[PDB]
Amino acid sequence: MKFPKDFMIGYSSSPFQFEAGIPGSEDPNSDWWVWVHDPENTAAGLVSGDFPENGPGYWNLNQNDHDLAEKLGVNTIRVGVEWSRIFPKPTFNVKVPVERDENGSIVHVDVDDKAVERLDELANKEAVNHYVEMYKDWVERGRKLILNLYHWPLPLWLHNPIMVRRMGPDRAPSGWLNEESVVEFAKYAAYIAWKMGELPVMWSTMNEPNVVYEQGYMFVKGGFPPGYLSLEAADKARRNMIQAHARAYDNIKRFSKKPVGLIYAFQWFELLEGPAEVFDKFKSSKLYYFTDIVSKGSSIINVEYRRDLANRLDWLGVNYYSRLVYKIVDDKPIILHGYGFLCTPGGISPAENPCSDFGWEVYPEGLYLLLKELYNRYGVDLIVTENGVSDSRDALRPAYLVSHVYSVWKAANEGIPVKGYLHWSLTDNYEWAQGFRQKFGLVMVDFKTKKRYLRPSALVFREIATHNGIPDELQHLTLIQ
Amino acid sequence: MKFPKDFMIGYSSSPFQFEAGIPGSEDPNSDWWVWVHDPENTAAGLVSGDFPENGPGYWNLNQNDHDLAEKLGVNTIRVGVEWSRIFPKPTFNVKVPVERDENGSIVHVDVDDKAVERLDELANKEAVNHYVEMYKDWVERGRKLILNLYHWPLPLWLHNPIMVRRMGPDRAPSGWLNEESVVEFAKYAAYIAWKMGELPVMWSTMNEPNVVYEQGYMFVKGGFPPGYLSLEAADKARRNMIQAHARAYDNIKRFSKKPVGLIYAFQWFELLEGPAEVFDKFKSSKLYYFTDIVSKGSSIINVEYRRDLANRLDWLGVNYYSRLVYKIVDDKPIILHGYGFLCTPGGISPAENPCSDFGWEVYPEGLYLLLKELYNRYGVDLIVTENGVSDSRDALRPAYLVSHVYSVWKAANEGIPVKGYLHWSLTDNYEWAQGFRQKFGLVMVDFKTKKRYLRPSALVFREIATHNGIPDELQHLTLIQ
Amino acid sequence: MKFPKDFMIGYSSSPFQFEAGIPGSEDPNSDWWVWVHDPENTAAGLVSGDFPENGPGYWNLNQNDHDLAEKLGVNTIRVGVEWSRIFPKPTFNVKVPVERDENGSIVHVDVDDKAVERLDELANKEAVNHYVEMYKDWVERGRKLILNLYHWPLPLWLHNPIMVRRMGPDRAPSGWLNEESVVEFAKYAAYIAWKMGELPVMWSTMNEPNVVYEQGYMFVKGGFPPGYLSLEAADKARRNMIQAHARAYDNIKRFSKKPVGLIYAFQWFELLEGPAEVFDKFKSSKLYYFTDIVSKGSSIINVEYRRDLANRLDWLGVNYYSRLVYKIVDDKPIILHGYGFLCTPGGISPAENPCSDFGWEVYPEGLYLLLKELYNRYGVDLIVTENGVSDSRDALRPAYLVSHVYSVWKAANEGIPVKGYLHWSLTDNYEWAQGFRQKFGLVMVDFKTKKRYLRPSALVFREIATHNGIPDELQHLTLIQ
Amino acid sequence: MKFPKDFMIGYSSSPFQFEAGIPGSEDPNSDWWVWVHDPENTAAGLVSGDFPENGPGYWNLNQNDHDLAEKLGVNTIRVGVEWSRIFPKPTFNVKVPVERDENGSIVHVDVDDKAVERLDELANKEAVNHYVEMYKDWVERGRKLILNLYHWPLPLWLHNPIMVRRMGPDRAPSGWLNEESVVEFAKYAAYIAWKMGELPVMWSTMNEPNVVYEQGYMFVKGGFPPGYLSLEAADKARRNMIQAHARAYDNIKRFSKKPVGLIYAFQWFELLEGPAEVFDKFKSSKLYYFTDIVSKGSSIINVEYRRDLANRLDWLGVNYYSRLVYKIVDDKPIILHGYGFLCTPGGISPAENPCSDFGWEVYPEGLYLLLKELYNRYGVDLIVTENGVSDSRDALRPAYLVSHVYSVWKAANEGIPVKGYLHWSLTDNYEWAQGFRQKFGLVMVDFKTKKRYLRPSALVFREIATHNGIPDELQHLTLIQ
């Protein structure tokens, strides 16, 4: 009931949700910053009203959190870098060659040493140096760092969310709806690879890209920018994000021969008795479309094979929280509320499973099933880059932690190459549109004083990290809540 | 514990939520029709997915519901007429003189007999004749009818909600954002006044106009068209709706000397201990702004006195369901969740009050306080044009009904000229973006068979209507639930 | 959806739970009276602490309740007579011949005219005359009365509950544990038959005798006298009660040729999938044992045939409230909590059924299944003598009423000779050890003022009684809650 | 935020609830053993149906639990010895001088060396040696042991509970109702003192004696033997238990000069605003009566001063779990349900406090107030001998543990001589009549396999024990849940 020698155990974080908190560390130059400070979004209830500047303040407290992490047995951490802190001003003018196929696809972006030297002139050195400083503080402790380049926020010069909602995508800097975002992201990737390449053991181009376009252009009641309902816009954004990844991959490899992958949000799909295999297609079209393209260069019923997109997934980051259950075959399976992410805060699902403060059903088995299926589908190394639960009372986290770590063990014990488990957040943080009311930390944070408090789950985590597995004395928590 | 001789007792309904249900009676020409059938709105969860064509089918069953109403003691009913059923095609070309002041305000719209004869040529006779037929069926029973001209849906030729959201108000037929809506509404009002003027005992220009612009341009998560977040758009719509009312009033009076008023959505505002009188201003700015203008011709801290808007409120229709509670003075009182409309479905408020299926707190005292305050503010005749509760099990309606009828009695007993009480809906209906899951009927409706079933609250209603008051034997329900 | 012409519709009541309430009407001479006033029982929580003297006061208000009943459409009522009010003093000395078989069974008790004349000398005339007065007040209205002789309380001279618990049955007047109770009950039966024989259309010797011995000697935590845990005592009491019934039957028939039956408490038993038929035996041993003996003169695996007990069930009174669900075959089926009577107050059962204030699952289908099974088992006329629900808010009663009346209709429509439906209580009353916190009335009673208030369910009842069935307009309530 | 150097930290256990579990270790010779195996008690629901033989099996696993305890930082443990395991056969015949005053009180029992040598001949050596073995295993680790002589079960030769209930106390071996129990207990105490005197650092004559007589003779629905409702029997048992303590104290002192005290169940009494001081008397009569007598030799309004009972409380063991709240002065304060021990499982009290699985309100402040009050009343050294919470999910224990440890710190910090804190149970155990459904362990026990699993609260306990206080990093849990 122990993991391999070099198995990575730790947690993940993002720039936007943890950095700000102490005066002077804000990043007012991103779409998300403007979006959550917007009066109309607030009045409408799209955003909670809480501010990132009142966050945990990792930008200033990094050293103390790293010590806390180390005290709990964290040996590996996955972090990101804000595009907008690195390039507050537009990088549009740094030309760079861009190869386009017959259909307008950006099959190649060439960012050479001169371009990088030029980008380095536009970059915000204070931020760049501060990132190296924070991450070097963790790495020089003899610990591993996984660096993710993108975790949602976009620079305002690239995306003006408010203007996109009022005027339409065609009359405003439209973020991922602007194909040039691909080129700019590629330049940003090369620069980071060249500047911080020595720090990480692995790279990740982006975090849950699917959530960005699904929330921003489909599930608009979720409060994600630009909140512009349009399936057409969603597909466009998805398309450019897939390209942005492929191009970022090429450019990172030019300055860093380290593994380059992608962190993705996977819900474990499920349905009726033996309805049909029409579900498999369903899953291929919505759940596995994106990772299929960036690995195989194609997807379901679509001969198209793009070489510039294929073979660009050295490892796969798995963010797992719960499941999604559907009904009916026909040609349209439908979502059943009361299951997975569609439960009530603190409630119980029809399957007798407890639900988080977010109203997400605790379902550890899904992680097990997800991992096996991913490996059979892609055969690539996997890392649980995110797994946790909104639970301010810590009434679920302890069991939730042991349950999912077990599912990971079970998968590894069966040969699945899962290289590590990273818990979502060591500390509470800014839960995007939801604000601070959603607490995922193993460590509670008083956002007024910025003090960190250990929740009992944190103690449980230390036992697991220290034992590099689940000690017999904690085997009972592989069950439920 | 009885009301005056001619006190009106009954219920209210709207075209959109009750008419369709039987094939062939749909009105596919309004913004709301397109809006609730929209794939994206549905996927996003903005609308429930339920369809109005599966409603109660009053358009075909009117006679049966009128008998049911009569069997229950209903002596008065308030109904509406869909602008889009009357004028499916644009009325823009029927010129008509339009007087504009220096600021662009439409202070006068002259629709004479020729214009009316012309409008009558564009009108959909089948619909016009069917309305006269349905309402004549009720009136010729020796009962009273209150006719409301507008209850939300707008003709598509005037408002294309989907296009407004995608392109922006300036690139689409923008409904109330288009000042010409004022002129068109005035023409529509004159035509109805001239065509159906003999039917009603009183007129209402519109139903809860504030909900239309607040939901459509501010509280966009509510699923109201066009769902275009913009405080600027909200004020503009409000402005034109205020003008539309004033102009509709002038044109109705030209063909009908009967009382012309307005039905409005009033929440009973409340706050802390003795925080301040800054609240009064708050109420004048958000709650009483609109009815102040259409009566006094002005509002708080705004000398402006508009004669073309003042003196256009012969009676006030009061739609009451619950309250809203605030906190803090400063300069920004804030809403306290867990109170009034912000409670949980079936829950209990911090004040031990039961909450409806809609999550709205039962608070009968508010109606009492609201009526007194309205009379002292406006001194005009009042009619509770709406009062009911979302409650499919009828676990609250019986007490909810007696409670509020009591508050009205209490007010009348103290001299307040409340001329009647109309319960919201005799039967369940299509609750807009919420679909059919919200049941307000005294009578349950199986939307599959269209059959009407009496809920016990219906029996209680009959006792009240028959006794024209609250019999001693039912006095215990003036309490709570 | 209507019952036969002469179908009986009304309600039932008992002496102890409704009579007292107005000073001077108490009956301090029964075991139950002393039992609920006992300091130790109260401190222990065996009894609630509420007093019968604070009840509805039917003894004084009978005329007003009869009018209320009549106003609601009640055409038939089932009432009882307190043994202890009729014979406050011991009747032991009125000799009377008693025939005993070889095993000590009391196969015959001869109470002739002289004995009756003698008993009439010991009887409390004021009470006897007052009963005739109350019941004559109902009957002379042209309504039916069903008279039940025993509804739990026993005279103190026959049963001293407190002394039985402290000293043991062998050192105290032990109620039904004293076989002489059979002889005394027989004398009491003849006297009532001779004295009040003209009033009722049918007789009932006793009400739910099984509850008396099961609660009093087995389920002692229920607070029933004498609360003396002993399976041996339970069987003895059951044995003498069976004899008491047979003997009472013989003696009533001597002075009244009217139908004589028994009212019984039937739970609808249920179990697993297809476990076995070992359940049938189970049911025969616990549920149908008693009514089997008083009708067939024998029971399961027990050749014994007693002629003095058989053929003494002209009709069967059915008291139905909920079900009981079991698990496992083996030789011992076990009760599953969370079902039927073992639910939580106001909760929901694993089958999505609402639960009463008593924590009893609403399950109308059980009544249907129970009636068919009873008829096939006994082939005797049946009358639902009790059916209702503890629900002070009247959140279940309306639907509960229509549901069960429907099950009865369904049974009658299929040929089952169910002669009537009597709702448990028109008004709230003293719910034995539970006190007043359990409200079963269709009419709420303020026990402080003694005023009766109609609950909406009462209105629903009137519709059913008046229509002598379930009108179409109320068909939706044949469902659930 | 640390306790003194030699502050005792650990947990308590009892023989009956932990010893059995592995075949062959049962103690079938006590009243509790027979009582929980009784068919009638089970059918009646007086006992759960669970069996002690399926318990944790400490009798065989002691060494493993001691290691677990030590691993968690436990430095002190309080245990008991079953009277019935030591003397399975009657000790009645070992004469021994008994001094009786004028009123029959047993003021003195002389057990000399010969008597002890004789008792040692009747004692069950296997049990005696096994106890010394188990406790020596803990003590020889350099840890402290507190030995309690009585924790409820009585030998069958002294108490036949079933026979007491059926026949009455006067026709059966009536346990504490038999004054000779005083003499036998005194003999048992001298023997244990002489045989195991070297092991403990302190003695306790009995555990929560008040619960024994209150549950057994008053709150009979609780399922405690003999379940014989009688206030007269309760006072008698209380009287003899008070004497048994005094006599046990005298005889322990003869063979052991170590501190001899008593462990008691204290609820924290509370009431209205400023009702009166009639409450103080109330508390003295029910809560502090017993400990008053064994210390002062008298109680409220009762001049009587008994020298043979006074000065026999060297230290006081405090068992605290929750409070009890009353209302009204008059002459009879009454208990308010919904507070303290009268809450619902998992619910919340009217004061916003979480409630345990037992339905007991978490109220840490009570322990603080209780300790101060006890010290001011008695001025004796205090030890929290019991404190814990029924919580199988460990959703409350972590905070419950830190809260109460804080209350103790607060008391010690203010000078109150509280010498230690013992948590109720390291592991889950047999919760008497409630069976295994009530889990109080810091460590979960799978009673099927007998395996011990650490609950997160156990980890929190270790931090406290190791730090000999509440570390800053855990200060947030001194609040609520």
Domain boundaries, chain C: 1-481
Cα gap A194→A253, rounded to integer Å = 10
Residues 6 or more apart in contact with residue C280 via CB below 8 angstroms: none
Supply B30's token pair.
């309004």
Query: Is the preceding omega at residue C226 within 30 degrees of 0, hence cis?
Result: yes
Percent of chain B that is helix, strand, coil (3-state, to 5):
40, 15, 40
DSSP type of residue B183: H
Angle at C293 between CA C291 and CA C298, to 5 degrees: 140
Torsion of CA D135, D139, D145, D147, to 10 degrees: 30
DSSP type of residue C170: G
Cα gap C242→C248, rounded to integer Å = 10
Cα gap C58→C63, rounded to integer Å = 8
Position B454, amino acid: L
CATH number of B1-481: 3.20.20.80
Residue B395 contacts residue B407 (beta carbons within 8 Å): no
Cα gap A67→D74, rounded to integer Å = 29
**Tokens 């309530």 map to which residue?**
C477
**Tokens 């122990």 map to which residue?**
A2
CA distances from D187 to D248, D251, D252, D312 (A): 8, 8, 10, 17
CA distances from A199 to A204, A425, C223 (A): 13, 20, 75
Pairing of strands A315-319, A260-265: parallel
Could you tell me how many residues make up chain C? Answer: 481
Cα gap D346→D355, rounded to integer Å = 5
Method used to determine the 3D structure: X-ray
Residue B384 contacts residue B404 (beta carbons within 8 Å): yes
Instruction: Report the first-to-last Cα separation within chain B, whole angstroms.
Output: 21
Å between D41 CA and nearest CA of chain C: 8
Residues 6 or more apart in contact with residue C135 via CB below 8 angstroms: C79, C145, C147, C196, C199, C200
Query: Which of A324, A180, A159, A287 is CA-nearest to residue A227?
Result: A159
Residues 6 or more apart in contact with residue C129 via CB below 8 angstroms: none
Å between B167 CA and nearest CA of chain C: 47
**Tokens 């990575």 map to which residue?**
A8
Residues 6 or more apart in contact with residue C439 via CB below 8 angstroms: C357, C390, C391, C392, C428
Residue C213 contacts residue C243 (beta carbons within 8 Å): no
Residues of C in contact with B481 (CB under 8 A): 393
The 3-state DSSP class for residue C3 equals: coil
Å between B45 CA and nearest CA of chain A: 7
Cα gap C203→C79, rounded to integer Å = 10
Percent of chain D that is helix, strand, coil (3-state, to 5):
40, 15, 40
Half-sphere exposure of D314 (CA within 13 A, CB side): 14
Cα gap B27→B34, rounded to integer Å = 10
Cα gap D294→D289, rounded to integer Å = 9
Supply C410's token pair.
């369904």
Torsion of CA B461, B467, B468, B470, to 10 degrees: -70
Residues of D in contact with A473 (CB under 8 A): 452-454
Cα gap C339→C320, rounded to integer Å = 15
Cα gap A259→C268, rounded to integer Å = 67
Residue B293 contacts residue B232 (beta carbons within 8 Å): no
Supply B103's token pair.
């600021």
Residues of C in contact with D171 (CB under 8 A): 168
Cα gap B335→B338, rounded to integer Å = 10
Chain D residue set in contact with C, beta carbons under 8 Å: 39-41, 43-46, 165-168, 171, 218-221, 227, 229-231
Residues 6 or more apart in contact with residue D463 via CB below 8 angstroms: A459, D471, D474
Q: What are phi and psi of B43, to 5 degrees?
A: -60, -40
Alpha-helix runs per DSSP H in D168-311: 180-196, 209-217, 231-255, 278-286, 293-296
The 3-state DSSP class for residue C200 equals: coil
Cα gap A94→A128, rounded to integer Å = 19
Cα gap B351→A180, rounded to integer Å = 56
Instruction: Report the first-to-last Cα separation within chain A, whole angstroms.
Output: 21
Supply B402's token pair.
């007696």
Residues of A in contact with D394 (CB under 8 A): 398, 456
How many C-beta neighbours within 10 Å does residue B450 have? 17
Residue B478 contacts residue B469 (beta carbons within 8 Å): no
Cα gap C58→C60, rounded to integer Å = 5
Element (H, E) at B451: strand B451-454
What is the side-by-side order of every strand in the sheet holding A268-270?
A: A268-270, A323-327, A334-335
- Please, which chains are in contact with B (at least 3 CB pairs closer than 8 A)? A, C
Give one word for A168, left, alpha or beta, with left for phi > 0 and alpha for psi -120 to 50. left
Cα gap C292→C377, rounded to integer Å = 9
Half-sphere exposure of B59 (CA within 13 A, CB side): 26
Cα gap B178→C59, rounded to integer Å = 75
CA distances from A329 to A266, A272, D234 (A): 22, 9, 69
Q: Which of A353, A393, A476 to mutate to test the interface with D (most CBs of D within 10 A)?
A: A476
Report the residue numbers after which chain D has a gap, meaning the C atom sits over 2.5 angstroms from the next written residue's N, or none. none
CB contact under 8 A, D221 and C45: yes
Supply D442's token pair.
């810091």
- SS3 of chain A: the string is CECCCCCEEEEECCHHHHCCCCCCCCCCCEHHHHHHHCHHHHHHCCCCCCCHHHCCCHHHHHHHHHHHHHHCCCCEEEEECCHHHHCCCCCCCCCCCEEECCCCCEEEECCCHHHHHHHHHHCCHHHHHHHHHHHHHHHCCCCEEEEECCCCCCECCCECHHHHHHHCHHHCCEHHHCCHHHHHHHHHHHHHHHHHCCCCCEEEEEECHHHHHHHHHCCHHHCCCCCCCCHHHHHHHHHHHHHHHHHHHHHHHHHCCCCEEEEEECCEEECCCCCCCHHHHHHHHHCCCCCCHHHHCCCCCCCCCCCCCCCCCCEEEEECCCEEEEECCCCCCEECCCCHHHCCCCCECCCCCEECCCCCECCCHHHHHHHHHHHHHHCCEEEEEECCCCCCCCCCHHHHHHHHHHHHHHHHHCCCCEEEEEEECCECCCCHHHCCCCCCCCEEEECCCCEEEECHHHHHHHHHHHHCECCHHHHHHHCCC
DSSP type of residue D205: E
Residue D233 contacts residue D169 (beta carbons within 8 Å): yes
Cα gap A217→B136, rounded to integer Å = 48
Of the candidates A19, A53, A179, A386, the residue annotated as catalytic is A386
CA distances from D17 to A199, C42, C440, D124, D383 (A): 57, 30, 43, 20, 21
Angle at D300 between CA D299 and CA D304, to 5 degrees: 55
CB contact under 8 A, B165 and A43: no
Q: At what angle do helices B125-139 and B58-71 cross, to 10 degrees?
A: 10
Supply D331's token pair.
């002459």
Cα gap C376→C388, rounded to integer Å = 25
Position C208, amino acid: E
Of the candidates D19, D82, D184, D386, the residue annotated as catalytic is D386
Cα gap B276→B263, rounded to integer Å = 30
Supply C280's token pair.
């049938």
Environment class of A37 (CB within 10 Å of its CB; exposed 0-12, middle 13-18, buried 19+): middle
Angle at A393 between CA A392 and CA A394, to 5 degrees: 95
Supply A14's token pair.
């993002």
Residues of A in contact with B165 (CB under 8 A): 229
Angle at A142 between CA A136 and CA A147, to 5 degrees: 50
Position D28, amino acid: P
CA distances from A152 to A82, A241, B370 (A): 9, 11, 47
The 3-state DSSP class for residue D181 equals: helix
Supply A82's token pair.
């804000």
Cα gap A87→A122, rounded to integer Å = 7
Residue A58 contacts residue A19 (beta carbons within 8 Å): yes
Query: Which of C34, C82, C37 is CA-nearest to residue C58?
Result: C82
Å between C324 CA and nearest CA of chain D: 15
Cα gap B185→C24, rounded to integer Å = 75
Position B428, amino acid: D
Query: Which of D36, D56, D66 is CA-nearest to residue D144?
Result: D66
Residues 6 or more apart in contact with residue A310 via CB below 8 angstroms: A293, A294, A295, A296, A297, A298
Torsion of CA A187, A190, A194, A196, to 10 degrees: 90
Percent of chain C that is helix, strand, coil (3-state, to 5):
40, 15, 40
CA distances from B268 to B271, B323, B341, B374, B419 (A): 10, 4, 10, 11, 20
CB contact under 8 A, C456 and B452: no
CA distances from D378 to D30, D311, D404, D410 (A): 34, 11, 21, 19
- Please, which chains are in contact with C (at least 3 CB pairs closer than 8 A)? B, D
Cα gap B300→A392, rounded to integer Å = 44
Environment class of D42 (CB within 10 Å of its CB; exposed 0-12, middle 13-18, buried 19+): middle
Q: At what angle do helices B180-196 and B113-122 cross, to 10 degrees?
A: 90
Half-sphere exposure of C163 (CA within 13 A, CB side): 12
Q: Is the dihedral of CA D446, D450, D451, D457 positive or negative?
A: positive
Q: Is the dihedral of CA A360, A364, A365, A369 positive or negative?
A: positive
Q: What are phi and psi of B272, to 5 degrees?
A: -60, -155
Cα gap A335→A339, rounded to integer Å = 9
Q: What are phi and psi of B250, to 5 degrees?
A: -60, -45
Cα gap A157→A150, rounded to integer Å = 16
Angle at D139 between CA D138 and CA D140, to 5 degrees: 95
User: Which of D451, D459, D476 lies closest to A459 in CB terms?
Assistant: D459
Annotated active-site residue A386? The verdict is yes
**Tokens 């009243």 map to which residue?**
D31
- Bridge partners of A174, per DSSP, are A159
Q: At what angle do helices A456-467 and A397-413 cross, to 10 degrees?
A: 20
Cα gap A229→B161, rounded to integer Å = 13
DSSP type of residue B178: S
The 3-state DSSP class for residue B463 equals: helix
DSSP type of residue B389: -
Supply B405's token pair.
């009828």
Cα gap A144→B211, rounded to integer Å = 55
Q: Report the Cα D230 to chain-centroid distance in Å.
A: 23
CA distances from D234 to B43, D85, D120 (A): 69, 26, 32
